[PDB]
Design a protein around this ligand. Structure first.
Ligand SMILES: CCCCCCCCCCCCCCCCCC(=O)OC[C@H](COP(=O)([O-])OCC(O)COP(=O)([O-])OC[C@@H](COC(=O)CCCCCCCCCCCCCCCCC)OC(=O)CCCCCCCCCCCCCCCCC)OC(=O)CCCCCCCCCCCCCCCCC
Ligand SMILES: CCCCCCCCCCCCCCCCCC(=O)OC[C@H](COP(=O)([O-])OCC[N+](C)(C)C)OC(=O)CCCCCCCCCCCCCCCCC
Ligand SMILES: NC(=O)C1=CN([C@@H]2O[C@H](COP(=O)(O)OP(=O)(O)OC[C@H]3O[C@@H](n4cnc5c(N)ncnc54)[C@H](OP(=O)(O)O)[C@@H]3O)[C@@H](O)[C@H]2O)C=CC1
Ligand SMILES: CCCCCCCCCCCC(=O)SCCNC(=O)CCNC(=O)[C@H](O)C(C)(C)COP(=O)(O)O
Ligand SMILES: [Zn+2]
Lengths: 94, 338, 40, 47, 69, 91, 181, 86, 430, 198
């Protein structure tokens, strides 16, 4: 979580604010946004809320390359695992 | 100066092309086609002319090139006054010149005047006017100082003078252009109809010819305007293949169904008669002289491929213009319906 | 009776409905939208 | 022969092209310094 | 005649395969049959015209026909 | 007398003025401004003046009325249909 | 312009109300497949005059647009164009027009090239299709026409004044006691 | 083949009445062509190739040479869609 | 009056063709192909480290999205080149850079406090609404300049001392806010654009949290920010960080920016490509100029200060040879060899949906449930303000942007009203 | 209306399965009556009219169609009453109307038929009334009505080698293409349309 700035160029979380399909990602963001921001001060962590939207974690690595992870019906542990995989895969991507 | 020309070719006659063009010598066979090429995209076209008879269809049909408010006809043009040229090309960013000695003229002085004096004055006027972006002079293929033909002899000097006066001038050297109102297919048809027994040749008919369609010539003009780098260079325009005069006669005979018959007159006696008698369209010394000469595309200058125009083959192009004049032999009853 | 009589009757019925215009329909000012905050 | 004036006026009624600088001009860093062409007087600046 | 229809490869041509295998839809089939009629100066009745399924049947029909030029 | 000055704009109704009256020859394709400017101010005793642009109804413009009792005495007022300018004969 | 609620309950009427969900076909659309899915999930499921969220619907070049007449050899740009469906209200200049507006849905097409010719300065339109607006009694009819003719359509719903209590007695109001603070 | 392409563009129809009306119109236009009611230049618009040059003219490949291996969007962007004079 | 009579600017000083400036300074017209080819060559030659961009005032969602995608594919991440003034706000949550309370929230708030805001000059319609609210039930306080507002206001001060006191709780206005129900805080973008904008923003956050401007029991979020650049609002919506500034940039892309530009911002040796519609400013810093469409000529999306996303429609096509900015960026990317995945407006809006779907719900404000989290005050933040006055950026209401500067009616209004409206003193009558 | 008038109730007495919707107005002549007739019964009704005793002396004066889809009351919207004929225009794709004159009864009878199907199918009556041939040809070409069992469907008053329905409200008066003369083809050609806007 401390290496997000160097590994990735942007993290984005697009989900719905009143759907059970997004509940997990919604709660995880609400709980850990400040932790991640403190760990990585200047890194962009964008949050976007739209009703009846599919949960999605979008990691932009470098040179306009992005990976989109479908995080529907995923517990906070699953969201943690997906984010960790996205951060770790930066070396393989570039 | 700048040779760039920003114009929009995606519009019809009522659009604004962005080309303001003055076309000298547009009363000839190729004049209406060249004018229509620019007019049909919305360009403004000016046609300066001093033609007799004024009521001729050649003058009249020039008004159809662009339309109302876009095509203008400047009558009673004076070809030895610089003010006349200045007025003609005052608002034109394109200046096309097709003023060349007619096939009916045998006088060397008149041919030189038409092919040199007018061209040089037009080039000088273009140089004076800083808004003339492009100049397109029409020379003839095979132009040379040693050419026996007075027309070609004077056209070589004319193109040299145009280049000297306006270094950004584009010189075309078309081969024998054919079409509905041409001097080649129409002349063949009319001569064979007037004799009914033969076409009168005055040579061995081994001279090479590389015909090009007038539509292809117009497309070449448009492509030359589009291509900025074409400025200041000489182009030779011709068909994909080269045929001799005998081969051209054979192709026309095969296409039209009319059996061929070439009646030979000695070249010397024909030359003497034509140079000592009155000359008109169908009886002139220029035709006799050019029968022997070769008018083809040489590799010394740029070709049509440089303009990126694919000319159509002569057998395909000339077939439509001889549909009416077709031999009526044995035909099917279904074909009798017409 | 032909099959299309039912369609004709449907057309006649719908042609007789009362009609009103959105321009003349009253619209009241909506109350303030209650802002919601994610728990914890 | 004066069609250019009428055409330019008609074009400017709806859209007048910006007159770009021509020839040598003064430069302040990466900027070309040109006096304002607005006929109106900047009264607040003047007084 | 087929040389006009450049979708089909005349080199490896199987006279028993269907027009669809050759690469001709119904419109292409109708155009091809009309072209063959023009070539041989014949006229296929409606039944046979619609019944043709490959080039072999057309060849056999034209062979049986005596009016073909 | 700068046409773009604040004073000039305020006096001319926030329009750029043309003292020579020659620009109208091209702008409006006529010298009618110059022709009408020659007519002097017509002095009318009454506070309100009626103008019909002619000698009889239907021979000019619709009948209009102009107030010559200006908040500043003697200020000429121009008819809207025709450029004739009327002023009160202050005495 | 508003029939009684649930007055029409036909399958055709429900089909007209419902908007199709796009299927990624082009290479760009397949690359942006996630975007197409998000747009389908978020856009309103049905169109009704009571709706409040604007949206843009792509042209449906399908068997449903067979009734269009503006697909000819000379012109091939009219079909598939995007229109705008909205209620045109009376201008703010006047309140009682002789011919009042706002009683019909206007369908409009964005104007193409408009240029003043040099000879006389007359205005000319590159395309003559988008000169006049179309008018429909109901948004349902407008959308049905768009689906039948194969045009895409944006829909922008109207906004009207909020009713407020009006009374001449409000002109005279007692401010209150002078000592009040 | 060109008229086949014309029909293919309309092959999506699924309304028998509309198809019957279209067939009536097609027969009418075919009869006009037979009887010379129409002009050749006016009626050849149906027979003209969709993307191939006409066989009686020399075509210009300047656009293809300039924009070789470029997207149709970029080709249209460079071509423009409005007169630039106004 | 500005929005009513500033459209005249579009009628003159319009760029109608790509242009290039020689070292001598002589501008010359060129073709789109030539301009795009030279720009692509410069992009390929220039390392991504020394490439930067400036966001204009009238940038739209489509144009900013295309520019962001192109820069990302070139590996460029810094979207600001100016270092003098940058907005100090994070684009992570919409709640932290949009008016949490809508434009109708003034009609609901009982106390409204302005910080470096002049509603009369910026959003006059909002000023009229505030006048209605204060005549019915609303008390207005102001920390900054004492502008001639149409309604009575209580001027607490102009320095950051008032903010410090309110944050510390010793100022009586803290008790006033606590007593008041549904208080509102409106802050102009200039205050956050100050050098200490981050400190002022944190001070406002803590003040709001302590005084209940963001109350869960009331279900109220009175924290608001009044912006001055639609382009900046769009950039924040799309997630572009306003603080990311490239100190030294060799290749600058100015997307129609004409305000705050100074020679010092552009290095002498840099290469400037300016996407613009007027030549008043930014066209003189440009090595290459590309005409673009205006709001009346571009079919695009615009997000206003309250978060409402509306669709701006095409009235007339761009003048002359002008092209849509998103199309220009798409062509530039394809020529440079990094083609974008959208060739039409539909596909570009699909990409916009990928980035932030809520922009596809036109004329609607998407609610956010992370307002409290976004605006929560963190521990250990600087929160150190400077002892200087809080000012307002607008000087001449009739001249604020390039279109207004080019307009003639606006010039007449300026010359007819500036001297009559200028006054160093406050109208004690109201 | 100071004349002797009687409703044409014979049609609905004979065709016992149809409902009657009839109008008379002072906007029309004193002896003029409008009625609504379903399309699926139009042909049989014309058969009865052409050979009934008192309707035998009947001539089809006129025939045309109205694109009712875009019909809107521009003024006095609230004054509309449920008995007005305009109520049948709304939401109906097309409305084809015929008008006949009867000599025995000295009467004028107009019949309105509502076409709601998208293809605009209706049985032709040119086999019953001879002059209806060109009337129906014009109506079909100008509005796109698909007349069935028609003697001659060929266009009448439309240009050669063109398909269009100009009288539809969707169509623009300026058209979609203009005819010029092409020098390259040396003949009249037709190309895209650019016109003048006042
Ligand atoms: C009476 C007093 C008593 C004593 C007797 C006196 C003499 C009595 C003579 C009685 C007979 C008179 C007959 C002529 C009547 C008037 C007409 C006329 O003169 O001809 C013009 C007339 C014009 O043709 P047209 O059909 O009216 O034109 C229609 C359109 O304009 C065409 O429309 P288009 O669109 O198809 O245009 C195509 C193009 C033409 O088509 C083409 O493009 C292809 C051709 C281009 C080149 C043409 C060069 C000239 C060809 C001449 C051919 C002559 C015919 C015989 C050829 C035999 C070959 C083996 O148009 C043209 O150029 C038209 C032709 C121009 C001809 C110009 C020269 C004509 C005058 C000189 C002719 C000399 C011929 C001598 C023959 C040998 C005599 C022994 O016809 C001719 O040209 C043929 C005339 C042949 C007879 C000439 C008789 C006079 C000379 C005889 C020799 C000397 C006297 C000997 C006796 C002395 C006794 C003492
Ligand atoms: C009822 C009236 C009848 C009139 C008939 C007239 C017959 C032709 C008379 C020719 C006279 C020639 C005089 C000397 C010319 C000197 C110039 C010269 O260089 O000589 C060689 C001339 C010149 O031709 P060239 O081509 O060799 O050289 C041109 C001249 N230079 C070189 C100076 C530029 O040619 C000739 O052979 C003589 C002239 C032939 C003219 C042919 C056209 C005649 C048109 C007649 C119109 C009237 C018709 C009447 C009937 C109407 C019925 C409705
Ligand atoms: N087979 C061909 O067509 C070929 C043509 N060219 C060149 O292309 C040009 C155009 O083709 P085309 O139409 O066939 O040529 P034309 O002979 O038909 O036209 C020549 C033009 O120049 C005018 N003209 C002739 N002499 C003079 C003169 N002394 N003073 C002023 N004007 C004069 C003519 O007007 P007027 O009617 O008044 O005499 C005419 O308008 C030719 O002139 C020629 O230079 C080159 C190779 C082949
Ligand atoms: C001489 C010049 C004449 C010019 C005439 C111009 C006027 C033409 C009139 C309109 C003609 C039409 O479009 S008629 C429109 C006809 N309608 C349909 O074709 C829809 C149903 N289609 C099918 O059954 C198949 O697709 C099919 C493609 C037929 C075969 O395909 P194969 O089984 O796969
Ligand atoms: Zn008067």
């Amino acid at each position: 979580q401390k290496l997000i700035g160097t590994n990735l160029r942007e993290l984005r979380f697009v989900f719905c604010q009143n759907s059970q399909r997004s509940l997990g990602l919604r709660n995880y963001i609400a709980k850990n946004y400040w932790n991640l921001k403190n760990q990585n001060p200047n890194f962009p962590l964008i949050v976007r809320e739209c009703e009846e939207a599919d949960p999605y974690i979008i990691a932009r690595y470098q040179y306009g390359v992005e990976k989109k992870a479908f995080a529907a019906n995923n517990n906070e542990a699953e969201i943690e695992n997906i984010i960790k995989t996205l951060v770790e895969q930066s070396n393989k991507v570039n | 100066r700048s040779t760039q020309l920003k114009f929009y070719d995606g519009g019809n006659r009522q659009s604004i092309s962005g080309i303001r063009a003055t076309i000298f010598g547009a009363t000839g066979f190729m004049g209406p086609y060249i004018g229509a090429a620019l007019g049909y995209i919305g360009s403004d076209v000016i046609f300066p002319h001093n033609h007799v008879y004024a009521y001729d269809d050649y003058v009249k049909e020039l008004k159809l090139c662009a339309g109302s408010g876009q095509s203008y006809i400047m009558r009673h043009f004076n070809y030895d006054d610089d003010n006349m040229y200045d007025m003609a090309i005052k608002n034109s960013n394109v200046v096309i010149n097709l003023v060349g000695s007619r096939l009916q003229n045998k006088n060397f002085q008149k041919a030189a005047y038409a092919n040199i004096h007018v061209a040089k004055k037009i080039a000088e006027a273009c140089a004076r006017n800083p808004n003339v972006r492009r100049l397109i002079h029409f020379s003839a293929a095979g132009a040379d100082t040693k050419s026996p033909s007075p027309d070609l002899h004077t056209k070589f000097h004319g193109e040299e003078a145009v280049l000297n006066a306006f270094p950004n001038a584009t010189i075309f050297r078309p081969c024998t252009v054919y079409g509905m109102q041409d001097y080649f297919i129409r002349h063949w048809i009319k001569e064979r109809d007037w004799w009914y027994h033969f076409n009168i040749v005055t040579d061995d008919c081994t001279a090479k010819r590389q015909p090009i369609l007038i539509n292809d010539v117009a497309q070449c003009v448009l492509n030359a305007l589009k291509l900025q780098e074409s400025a200041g260079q000489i182009y030779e325009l011709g068909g994909p293949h080269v045929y001799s005069r005998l081969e051209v006669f054979e192709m026309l005979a095969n296409l039209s169904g009319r059996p061929p018959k070439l009646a030979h007159i000695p070249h010397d006696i024909a030359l003497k008669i034509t140079q000592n008698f009155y000359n008109w369209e169908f009886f002139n010394m220029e035709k006799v002289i050019k029968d022997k000469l070769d008018l083809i595309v040489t590799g010394k200058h740029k070709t049509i491929s440089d303009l990126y125009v694919q000319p159509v083959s002569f057998p395909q192009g000339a077939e439509q213009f001889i549909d009416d004049v077709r031999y009526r032999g044995v035909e099917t009853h279904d074909n009798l319906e017409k | 009776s032909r099959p299309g009589d039912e369609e004709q009757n449907e057309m006649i019925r719908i042609a007789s409905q009362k009609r009103v215009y959105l321009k003349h329909q009253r619209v009241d000012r909506p109350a303030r939208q209650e802002a919601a905050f994610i728990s914890s | 022969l004066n069609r250019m004036r009428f055409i330019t006026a008609q074009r400017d009624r709806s859209r007048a092209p910006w007159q770009s600088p021509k020839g040598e001009g003064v430069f302040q860093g990466k900027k070309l310094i040109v006096a304002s062409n607005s006929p109106f007087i900047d009264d607040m600046s003047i007084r | 005649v087929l040389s006009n229809f450049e979708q089909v490869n005349l080199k490896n041509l199987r006279w028993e395969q269907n027009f669809k295998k050759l690469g001709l839809d119904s419109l292409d089939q109708t155009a091809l049959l009309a072209s063959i009629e023009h070539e041989f100066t014949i006229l296929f009745p409606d039944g046979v015209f619609e019944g043709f399924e490959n080039l072999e049947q057309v060849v056999n029909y034209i062979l049986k026909n005596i009016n073909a030029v | 007398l700068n046409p773009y000055s604040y004073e000039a704009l305020k006096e001319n109704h926030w329009l750029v003025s043309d003292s020579s009256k020659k620009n109208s020859e091209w702008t409006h394709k006529s010298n009618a401004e110059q022709l009408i400017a020659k007519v002097p101010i017509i002095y009318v005793d009454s506070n309100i003046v009626r103008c019909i642009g002619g000698t009889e109804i239907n021979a000019g413009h619709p009948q209009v009325y102009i107030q010559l009792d200006t908040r500043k005495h003697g200020t000429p007022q121009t008819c809207k249909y025709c450029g004739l300018r009327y002023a009160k004969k202050m005495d | 312009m508003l029939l009684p609620k649930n007055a029409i309950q036909s399958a055709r009427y429900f089909e007209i109300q419902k908007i199709p969900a796009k299927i990624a076909k082009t290479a760009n659309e397949k690359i942006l497949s996630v975007g197409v899915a998000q747009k389908n999930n978020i856009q309103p499921k049905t169109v009704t005059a009571q709706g409040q969220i604007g949206f843009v619907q792509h042209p449906q070049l399908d068997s449903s647009c067979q009734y269009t007449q503006f697909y000819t050899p000379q012109r091939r740009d009219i079909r598939g164009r995007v229109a705008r469906i909205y209620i045109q209200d009376t201008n703010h200049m006047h309140d009682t027009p002789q011919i009042p507006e706002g009683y019909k849905w206007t369908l409009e097409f964005e104007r193409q090239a408009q240029y003043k010719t040099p000879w006389m300065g007359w205005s000319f339109n590159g395309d003559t299709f988008s000169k006049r607006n179309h008018y429909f009694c109901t948004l349902e009819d407008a959308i049905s026409y768009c689906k039948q003719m194969g045009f895409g359509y944006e829909v922008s719903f109207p906004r009207s004044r909020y009713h407020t209590r009006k009374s001449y007695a409000d002109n005279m109001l007692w401010p209150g006691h002078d000592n009040a603070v | 083949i060109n008229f086949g392409n014309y029909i293919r563009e309309r092959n999506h129809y699924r309304d028998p009445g509309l198809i019957d009306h279209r067939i009536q119109l097609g027969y009418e236009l075919l009869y006009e062509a037979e009887m010379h009611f129409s002009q050749h230049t006016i009626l050849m618009q149906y027979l003209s190739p969709y993307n191939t040059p006409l066989s009686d003219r020399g075509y210009s490949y300047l656009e293809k040479v300039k924009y070789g291996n470029k997207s149709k969007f970029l080709q249209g962007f460079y071509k423009g869609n409005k007169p630039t004079e106004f | 009056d500005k929005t009513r009579h500033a459209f005249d600017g579009l009628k003159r000083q319009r760029i109608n063709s790509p242009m290039k400036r020689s070292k001598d300074g002589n501008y010359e017209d060129i073709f789109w192909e030539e301009a795009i080819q030279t720009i692509s060559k410069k992009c390929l030659n220039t390392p991504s480290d020394q490439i930067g961009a400036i966001i204009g005032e009238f940038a739209d969602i489509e144009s900013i999205t295309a520019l962001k995608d192109f820069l990302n594919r070139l590996d460029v991440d810094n979207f600001e080149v100016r270092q003098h003034g940058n907005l100090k706000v994070s684009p992570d949550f919409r709640a932290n850079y949009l008016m949490n309370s809508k434009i109708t929230g003034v009609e609901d708030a009982d106390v409204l406090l302005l910080v470096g805001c002049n509603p009369r000059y910026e959003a006059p319609v909002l000023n009229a609404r505030i006048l209605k609210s204060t005549r019915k039930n609303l008390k207005v306080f102001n920390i900054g300049t004492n502008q001639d507002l149409n309604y009575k206001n209580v001027h607490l001060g102009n320095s950051t001392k008032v903010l410090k006191e309110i944050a510390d709780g010793t100022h009586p206005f803290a008790e006033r806010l606590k007593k008041a129900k549904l208080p509102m805080i409106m802050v102009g973008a200039s205050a956050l654009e100050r050098e200490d904008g981050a400190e002022l923003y944190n001070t406002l956050k803590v003040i709001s949290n302590k005084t209940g401007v963001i109350s869960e029991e009331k279900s109220w979020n009175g924290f608001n920010i009044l912006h001055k650049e639609m382009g900046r609002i769009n950039a924040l919506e799309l997630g572009i960080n306003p603080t990311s500034v490239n100190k030294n940039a060799k290749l600058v892309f100015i997307l129609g920016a004409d305000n705050n530009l100074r020679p010092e911002d552009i290095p002498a040796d840099a290469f400037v490509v300016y996407f613009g519609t007027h030549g008043d400013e930014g066209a003189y810093y440009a090595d290459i100029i590309l005409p673009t469409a205006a709001y009346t000529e571009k079919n695009a999306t615009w997000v206003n200060t309250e978060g409402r996303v509306q669709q701006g429609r095409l009235v007339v096509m761009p003048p002359g040879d002008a092209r849509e900015d998103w199309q220009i960026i798409r062509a530039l990317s394809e020529e440079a060899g990094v083609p974008l995945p959208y060739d039409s407006l539909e596909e570009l809006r699909y990409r916009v949906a990928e980035l932030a779907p809520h922009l596809l719900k036109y004329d609607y404000i998407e609610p956010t449930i992370f307002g409290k989290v976004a605006l929560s005050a963190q521990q250990g933040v600087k929160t150190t303000l400077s002892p200087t006055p809080i000012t307002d950026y607008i000087d001449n209401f009739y001249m604020t942007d390039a279109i207004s500067r080019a307009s003639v009616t606006m010039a007449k209004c300026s010359t007819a009203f500036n001297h009559e409206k200028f006054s160093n003193f406050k109208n004690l009558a109201k | 209306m100071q004349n002797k008038y009687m409703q044409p109730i014979q049609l609905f007495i004979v065709f016992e399965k149809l409902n009657s919707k009839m109008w008379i107005s002072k906007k029309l002549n004193s002896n003029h009556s409008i009625a609504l007739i379903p399309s699926n019964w139009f042909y049989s009704i014309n058969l009865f009219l052409k050979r009934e005793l008192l309707f035998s002396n009947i001539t089809l004066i006129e025939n045309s169609a109205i694109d009712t889809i875009s019909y809107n009351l521009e003024t006095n919207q609230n004054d509309l009453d449920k008995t007005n004929i305009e109520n049948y225009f709304f939401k109906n794709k097309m409305l084809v109307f015929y008008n006949y004159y009867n000599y025995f009864l000295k009467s004028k009878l107009t019949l309105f038929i509502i076409l709601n199907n998208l293809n605009k199918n209706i049985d032709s009556i040119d086999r019953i009334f001879a002059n209806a041939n060109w009337l129906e040809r014009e109506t079909s070409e100008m509005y796109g009505i698909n007349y069935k069992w028609k003697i001659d469907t060929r266009k009448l008053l439309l240009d050669y080698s063109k398909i269009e329905n100009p009288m539809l409200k969707e169509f623009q008066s300026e058209g979609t293409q203009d005819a010029f003369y092409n020098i390259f083809e040396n003949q009249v050609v037709v190309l895209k349309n650019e016109t003048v806007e006042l």
